[PDB]
Amino acid sequence: LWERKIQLEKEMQEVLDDVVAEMKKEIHRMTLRHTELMRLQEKLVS
Amino acid sequence: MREIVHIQGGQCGNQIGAKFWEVVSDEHGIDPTGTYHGDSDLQLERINVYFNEATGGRYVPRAILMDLEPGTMDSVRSGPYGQIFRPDNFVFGQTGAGNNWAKGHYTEGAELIDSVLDVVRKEAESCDCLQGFQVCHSLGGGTGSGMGTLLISKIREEYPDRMMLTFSVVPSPKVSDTVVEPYNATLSVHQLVENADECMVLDNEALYDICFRTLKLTTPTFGDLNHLISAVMSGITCCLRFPGQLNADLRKLAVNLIPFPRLHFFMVGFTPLTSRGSQQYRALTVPELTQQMWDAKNMMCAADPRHGRYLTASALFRGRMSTKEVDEQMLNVQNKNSSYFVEWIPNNVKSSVCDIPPKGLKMSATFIGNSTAIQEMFKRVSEQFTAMFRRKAFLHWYTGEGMDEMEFTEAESNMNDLVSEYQQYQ
Amino acid sequence: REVISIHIGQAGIQVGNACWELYCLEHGIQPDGQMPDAFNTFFSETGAGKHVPRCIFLDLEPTVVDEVRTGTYRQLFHPEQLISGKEDAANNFARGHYTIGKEIVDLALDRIRKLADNCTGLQGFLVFNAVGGGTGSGLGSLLLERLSVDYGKKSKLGFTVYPSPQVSTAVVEPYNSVLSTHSLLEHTDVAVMLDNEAIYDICRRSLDIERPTYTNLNRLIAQVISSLTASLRFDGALNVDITEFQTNLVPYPRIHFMLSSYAPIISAEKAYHEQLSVAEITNAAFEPASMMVKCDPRHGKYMACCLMYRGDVVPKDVNASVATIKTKRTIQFVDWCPTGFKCGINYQPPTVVPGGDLAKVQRAVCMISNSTAIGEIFSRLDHKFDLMYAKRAFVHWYVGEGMEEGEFSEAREDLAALEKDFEEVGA
Amino acid sequence: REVISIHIGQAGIQVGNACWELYCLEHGIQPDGQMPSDKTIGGGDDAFNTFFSETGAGKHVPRCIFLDLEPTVVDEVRTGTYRQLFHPEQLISGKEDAANNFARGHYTIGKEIVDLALDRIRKLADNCTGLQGFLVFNAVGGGTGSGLGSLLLERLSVDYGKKSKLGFTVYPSPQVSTAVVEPYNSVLSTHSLLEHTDVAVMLDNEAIYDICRRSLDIERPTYTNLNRLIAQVISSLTASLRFDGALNVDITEFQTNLVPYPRIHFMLSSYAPIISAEKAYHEQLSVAEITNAAFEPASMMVKCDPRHGKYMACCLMYRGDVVPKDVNASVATIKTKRTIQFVDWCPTGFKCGINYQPPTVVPGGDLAKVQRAVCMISNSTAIGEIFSRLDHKFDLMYAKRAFVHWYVGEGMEEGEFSEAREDLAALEKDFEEVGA
Amino acid sequence: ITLELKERLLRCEKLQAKFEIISAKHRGAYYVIKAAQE
Amino acid sequence: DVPEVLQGLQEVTRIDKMRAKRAFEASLPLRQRMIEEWEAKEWEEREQEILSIQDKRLELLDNALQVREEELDDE
Numbered sequence A: 001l002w003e004r005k006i007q008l009e010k011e012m013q014e015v016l017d018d019v020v021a022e023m024k025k026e027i028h029r030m031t032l033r034h035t036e037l038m039r040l041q042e043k044l045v046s
Numbered sequence B: 001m002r003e004i005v006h007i008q009g010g011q012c013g014n015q016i017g018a019k020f021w022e023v024v025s026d027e028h029g030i031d032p033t034g035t036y037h038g039d040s041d042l043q044l045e046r047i048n049v050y051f052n053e054a055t056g057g058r059y060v061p062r063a064i065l066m067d068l069e070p071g072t073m074d075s076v077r078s079g080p081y082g083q084i085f086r087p088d089n090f091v092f093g094q095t096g097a098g099n100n101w102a103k104g105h106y107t108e109g110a111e112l113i114d115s116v117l118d119v120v121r122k123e124a125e126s127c128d129c130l131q132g133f134q135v136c137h138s139l140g141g142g143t144g145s146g147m148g149t150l151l152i153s154k155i156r157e158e159y160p161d162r163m164m165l166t167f168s169v170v171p172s173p174k175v176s177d178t179v180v181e182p183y184n185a186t187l188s189v190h191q192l193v194e195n196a197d198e199c200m201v202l203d204n205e206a207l208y209d210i211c212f213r214t215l216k217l218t219t220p221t222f223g224d225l226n227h228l229i230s231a232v233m234s235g236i237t238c239c240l241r242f243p244g245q246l247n248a249d250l251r252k253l254a255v256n257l258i259p260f261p262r263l264h265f266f267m268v269g270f271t272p273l274t275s276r277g278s279q280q281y282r283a284l285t286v287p288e289l290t291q292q293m294w295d296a297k298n299m300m301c302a303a304d305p306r307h308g309r310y311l312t313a314s315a316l317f318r319g320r321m322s323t324k325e326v327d328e329q330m331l332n333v334q335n336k337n338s339s340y341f342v343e344w345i346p347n348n349v350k351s352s353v354c355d356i357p358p359k360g361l362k363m364s365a366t367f368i369g370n371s372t373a374i375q376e377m378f379k380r381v382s383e384q385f386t387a388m389f390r391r392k393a394f395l396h397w398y399t400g401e402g403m404d405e406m407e408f409t410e411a412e413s414n415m416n417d418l419v420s421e422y423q424q425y426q
Numbered sequence C: 001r002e003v004i005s006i007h008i009g010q011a012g013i014q015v016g017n018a019c020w021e022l023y024c025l026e027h028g029i030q031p032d033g034q035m036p037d038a039f040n041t042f043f044s045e046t047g048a049g050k051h052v053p054r055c056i057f058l059d060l061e062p063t064v065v066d067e068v069r070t071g072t073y074r075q076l077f078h079p080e081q082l083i084s085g086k087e088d089a090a091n092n093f094a095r096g097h098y099t100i101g102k103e104i105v106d107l108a109l110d111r112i113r114k115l116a117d118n119c120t121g122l123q124g125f126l127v128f129n130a131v132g133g134g135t136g137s138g139l140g141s142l143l144l145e146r147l148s149v150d151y152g153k154k155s156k157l158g159f160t161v162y163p164s165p166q167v168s169t170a171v172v173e174p175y176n177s178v179l180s181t182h183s184l185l186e187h188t189d190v191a192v193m194l195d196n197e198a199i200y201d202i203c204r205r206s207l208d209i210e211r212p213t214y215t216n217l218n219r220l221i222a223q224v225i226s227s228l229t230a231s232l233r234f235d236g237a238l239n240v241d242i243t244e245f246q247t248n249l250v251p252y253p254r255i256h257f258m259l260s261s262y263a264p265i266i267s268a269e270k271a272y273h274e275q276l277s278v279a280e281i282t283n284a285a286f287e288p289a290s291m292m293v294k295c296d297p298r299h300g301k302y303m304a305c306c307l308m309y310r311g312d313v314v315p316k317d318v319n320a321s322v323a324t325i326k327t328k329r330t331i332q333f334v335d336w337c338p339t340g341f342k343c344g345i346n347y348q349p350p351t352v353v354p355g356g357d358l359a360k361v362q363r364a365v366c367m368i369s370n371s372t373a374i375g376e377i378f379s380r381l382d383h384k385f386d387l388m389y390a391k392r393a394f395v396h397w398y399v400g401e402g403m404e405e406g407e408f409s410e411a412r413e414d415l416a417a418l419e420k421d422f423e424e425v426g427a
Numbered sequence D: 001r002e003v004i005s006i007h008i009g010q011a012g013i014q015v016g017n018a019c020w021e022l023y024c025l026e027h028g029i030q031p032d033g034q035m036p037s038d039k040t041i042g043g044g045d046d047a048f049n050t051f052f053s054e055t056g057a058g059k060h061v062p063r064c065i066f067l068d069l070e071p072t073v074v075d076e077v078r079t080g081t082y083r084q085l086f087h088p089e090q091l092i093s094g095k096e097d098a099a100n101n102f103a104r105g106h107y108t109i110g111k112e113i114v115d116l117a118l119d120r121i122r123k124l125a126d127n128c129t130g131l132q133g134f135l136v137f138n139a140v141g142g143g144t145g146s147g148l149g150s151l152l153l154e155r156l157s158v159d160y161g162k163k164s165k166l167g168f169t170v171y172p173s174p175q176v177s178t179a180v181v182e183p184y185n186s187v188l189s190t191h192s193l194l195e196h197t198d199v200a201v202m203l204d205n206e207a208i209y210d211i212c213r214r215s216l217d218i219e220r221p222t223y224t225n226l227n228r229l230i231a232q233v234i235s236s237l238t239a240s241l242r243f244d245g246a247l248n249v250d251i252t253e254f255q256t257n258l259v260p261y262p263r264i265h266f267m268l269s270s271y272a273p274i275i276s277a278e279k280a281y282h283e284q285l286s287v288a289e290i291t292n293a294a295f296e297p298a299s300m301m302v303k304c305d306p307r308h309g310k311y312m313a314c315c316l317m318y319r320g321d322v323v324p325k326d327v328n329a330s331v332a333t334i335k336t337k338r339t340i341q342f343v344d345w346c347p348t349g350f351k352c353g354i355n356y357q358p359p360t361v362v363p364g365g366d367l368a369k370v371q372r373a374v375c376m377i378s379n380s381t382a383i384g385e386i387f388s389r390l391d392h393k394f395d396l397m398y399a400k401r402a403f404v405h406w407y408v409g410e411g412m413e414e415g416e417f418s419e420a421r422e423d424l425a426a427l428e429k430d431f432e433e434v435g436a
Numbered sequence E: 001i002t003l004e005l006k007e008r009l010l011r012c013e014k015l016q017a018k019f020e021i022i023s024a025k026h027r028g029a030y031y032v033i034k035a036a037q038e
Numbered sequence F: 001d002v003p004e005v006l007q008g009l010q011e012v013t014r015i016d017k018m019r020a021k022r023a024f025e026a027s028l029p030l031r032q033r034m035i036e037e038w039e040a041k042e043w044e045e046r047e048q049e050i051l052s053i054q055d056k057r058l059e060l061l062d063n064a065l066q067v068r069e070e071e072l073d074d075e
């Protein structure tokens, strides 16, 4: 029983933990694109 | 916090333990009456590992004497320092094993073991944290070999997570005093290899040679042999009672020494041993202590370590010292004698230091080796056992009392594979 | 601005024993905690006129901590920060980690929590242990994981007394060290190794000590830690903090093992005569004879070094000495580091510690480098681990404690991957 | 604004013996009913109004009724170190013992002593000018505390009625226990205590042992150790009337802001900081961590985890020099704290009383002189578990009619046994229906 | 036989401690739900 | 959507498990936790499989112990 519990825990904690890295890369790159949006606004001001 | 209970089996064990308490009580500063009258506080600071306070400064040792005669206990009480013991621990029969393993393990052992476990349980319950037991006995008698073996097996069936330091005075042939030593020694080591966890080999042959050569004594009685054994036994276990720069307790020593699950048979030394004429013409430097410590005519065993490799070794120094000096000394020893050390273990040697030396001696040390030369004593007893047993000499005294023939042969086989494992690893 | 000190095992506790007696006299605080704000990083004012150190001493065997309880600093520490187990770990990694560790590590964490609550502006942790034994290895590899999963974002400076090749008191060090260095690779952030044999040689040569005990060693490491934290305790013309140091040095996430050095490590008789200045103290620190880990800096290219100058040092002679050391061809920097020095300075001279042979000097340099020279360290310890593990020796104790036979293999492969990483980044 | 005290049973009279010493030390009264001649006064001539009364020449006498049947502890007090302080007549000692028997405590022997204590109570009340309320101190696990205490509670409710009552009662621990037949007395006294005592404060022997073991660093505590901090708690409760409080709460604030329903009055108590001399000056006592230790579950006089329930409401009495900003920030931190959870129907549930008097120190004690202290009285809903566990103990005993003949040999029937059972059941149902 | 039984009981206790310490180390499974939701 | 997503009683049972998982995935478009609770249910199914394997091995071991004890008694 204790062995089965340890096996369950190691499997469930190995599955606990990288596409979010690339998705957040997209988020930050689009934040840059909206800094470019602000640039467009200042071009409108000019 | 750590606790040790000390048990004495047989006459040899009783005498060795009596001298051991005579030594350790002084090293703690308490007089025979039981009232402390020493000087410092480093003594009293951790004496709870051996003694129990009774009523306002009356300290009683945690030891149990046990045998099958009243005469030995009467002698122990009549001797000095025998008052401290609690009279309740004095357990004994009246008949006597009579150097008979069957009496000491099957009849009298059975009829006394239930009583003795009561008192050992009392001591092991009055404490708070046990780390291991101590047993003092021989391997060439009835009250010491068979009864001590039964006692340690009964302990193992009760405390399966503890060590025992079983100090076994092995029956040496040239110092043999009874006609059937091997019929006891083989049948004792049978279960010593199974249950006890640190069997310390000792032999009257090596003790007498030490006394004759180094001490230069003229009339060495059993007093001085017990003195040396007690000094070793008190030095091995000062890492608990005293604070050192590098502290190493019993479990640490056991795990460091024992590489494989059944090679626990330690050969032991002690330094410095001097005559009172040459103690004025010598220097107790650390290299000198190490050289005497590895002097092959100083280990308390008849098996010369030159006849084999060292599985591992351990040194326990006492007195304010230099740890770098210790380590470089042992490194020099290993490098110079690299042919005596197992090849598949780098740095075969362990070192520990305690900041308190035994009183008088401003510096001291102890050696515990696990060399493969130990097989010499076992082959040297197996030869005698086979030689007797080929024609069943003295065998009816055991067969009629309850042992079949196959048990002796199984003991032979166990002794043979025990002595063969060391040869295999050498 | 705070770092809290946790000492584990006898080596760490005694190193802290020297370190705190150094700090108390450096700040002016008596043993029983009273003056006759620089202490705020280490000492916290409690009540009125009483100061308590931000430290916890922890061990399983009780007598080593009882030494502190019965010494001269008995009034100083919080009477509970001196934790004690009941039975020693017996130099067994499995026993220290699993069997005994559970009952006491939760207490350690629940005390670290209230220490951090008492603190406000914490930089992080500084931990002391040795990866040779069982206590400081198992308890270290468990407590570090606990802190890295609870606080996570803090920096844990681990000053580890790594075991030396030739001089070695224990016998299961090749196992204990690999079992510790599995975790120590990926749970702490900066691991300053120290080697007993190297510091023995330093004591023998510079201080002409032929019987160097642990006390002098411990004083030496205490001085190193004081030089590391002086930039935070005090002010200087060019300072350095934990984030400064720890993001300047560590190039890649899995390469952080400092080499430590100190100067002028000189006794009084030579310190009164021989003159001292930056342009020769810096070279003296770089010399292999005065590096604290039994390693060979010549074999490995240097990646990034950090220098700290206690005492009166103007920021120009340090620049000149950096030039005059980078101009020497014997030491080779790594190819991709066009600049490989981070210098910091202070305004306080090192405080001579009564009871030692260390000099009272005008200025001193503490050097912490990161270089590929340490590959042979791991390689040789792994070689002797292989020696012991070829015949499955000593495995029975760990197996009976609970550890299987395969985690040894996984940790060995982890060390092998570490060595491969060092070789790749050396290339 | 005087408050009178009633101590019933050996436990009650022992707590009083260990608590009136605290009062006579706080108000600088010598332990023989007088003040020292020299000016050694903290300040004021009426800080002792609530407990004593000058009679012609500086001879103060406490407003205490020490009522007990068996006279072995009453005369122990009579011959103790407090002889010229106590009133010779207030100390009421009967003839024989109650012997863990609610029957003998409430019907046989009680009836011939309640009307003797009642006249002294009436004289004390008539002497009093601004009477505030009653503070009862008793043990439900015994005979006199449970039986005589419940009888006196009923016969004071029938007479005065409107006045508030604060009942500090001890219960048996879930495991640690001394008396064998204590569940019967506990349930029988609980039925009477339910609808008569205005506010019930709970204490537990093991719940004070374990605090004295983990905090005060005593591995062999005793009753003379528990009673001292019980006196500390009651002093923290009553200091508002005594001393000048910037944000102070009279006795009726407890009932006004901590009893949302008249049935629900059962309250956990906590007190911080429980520190001794060794660690006192090494730790720093601040309104954040003292409050946090108050609301941790390891420092409650009632052995019960507040996790299983929801804090309905709470009161925090602060002594010493405390600035209200820090306590406001501290209760904000508590409201942001995750583990303890409130019933959503109470958005404001922290009363924060504050005084200007630091905690006192008694010579030979354990607690040291400190700046500030806090007493936390919480109306939670974890106490239903306590009542239910006590009831489950009671059921096994009552199933086999054990010990029942001793009870029924007196005026006690089995009808009141059953009605006390169903009253505890109704209390269980009420607490659970409060629920979410 | 009793010797063997005691050895097995000790092994069971060791595995118990191992499991509990692994639990304490990891948690200090309810994290994957919020991880995916984020 | 895709045919033959993966590339033998156990295998057949795995196929049925996969079909049921796709069915529940389509069924549920917190609501997501009800998928996570079924992940927990499949974990419990793995636990049952572990239980069965241990039962088989332990039964064999019990038989072996009976055999050794019988031989000992006979001798």
Ligand SMILES: Nc1nc2c(ncn2[C@@H]2O[C@H](COP(=O)(O)OP(=O)(O)OP(=O)(O)O)[C@@H](O)[C@H]2O)c(=O)[nH]1
Binding pocket: B245, B246, B247, C008, C009, C010, C011, C012, C014, C015, C059, C061, C088, C089, C090, C091, C130, C131, C132, C133, C134, C135, C136, C137, C161, C163, C164, C168, C169, C170, C196, C214, C217, C218
């Ligand atoms: N610098 C320094 N190192 C020490 C000291 N004591 C031990 N060591 C080192 O610690 C290494 C092994 O650790 P241990 O001696 O077993 O100490 P530990 O790790 O705490 O083990 P425990 O006895 O269980 O507490 C040795 O190789 C020594 O080099 C010391 O006092 N000072």
Ligand SMILES: Nc1nc2c(ncn2[C@@H]2O[C@H](COP(=O)(O)OP(=O)(O)OP(=O)(O)O)[C@@H](O)[C@H]2O)c(=O)[nH]1
Binding pocket: D008, D009, D010, D011, D012, D014, D015, D069, D070, D097, D098, D099, D100, D101, D139, D140, D141, D142, D143, D144, D145, D146, D170, D172, D178, D179, D205, D223, D224, D226, D227
């Ligand atoms: N904390 C604390 N509890 C006490 C003390 N004295 C008695 N008790 C409690 O009182 C309970 C039993 O009630 P009793 O002490 O006998 O009081 P009683 O109601 O007067 O009973 P009788 O003396 O027989 O009339 C025990 O379970 C104790 O827990 C005390 O000094 N301190």
Ligand SMILES: Nc1nc2c(ncn2[C@@H]2O[C@H](COP(=O)(O)OP(=O)(O)O)[C@@H](O)[C@H]2O)c(=O)[nH]1
Binding pocket: B010, B011, B012, B013, B015, B016, B097, B098, B099, B104, B138, B140, B141, B142, B143, B144, B145, B169, B171, B175, B176, B177, B178, B204, B222, B225, B226
């Ligand atoms: N060191 C020491 N050994 C002894 C002493 N007396 C006997 N022996 C040894 O112990 C062995 C006898 O063991 P014994 O105590 O008689 O066991 P028993 O026969 O069961 O009682 C002999 O071989 C002796 O060499 C003694 O006083 N001191």
Ligand SMILES: [Mg+2]
Binding pocket: C009, C010, C011, C133, C135, C136
């Ligand atoms: Mg250690």
Ligand SMILES: [Mg+2]
Binding pocket: D009, D010, D068, D069, D070, D098, D142, D143, D144, D145
């Ligand atoms: Mg009573």
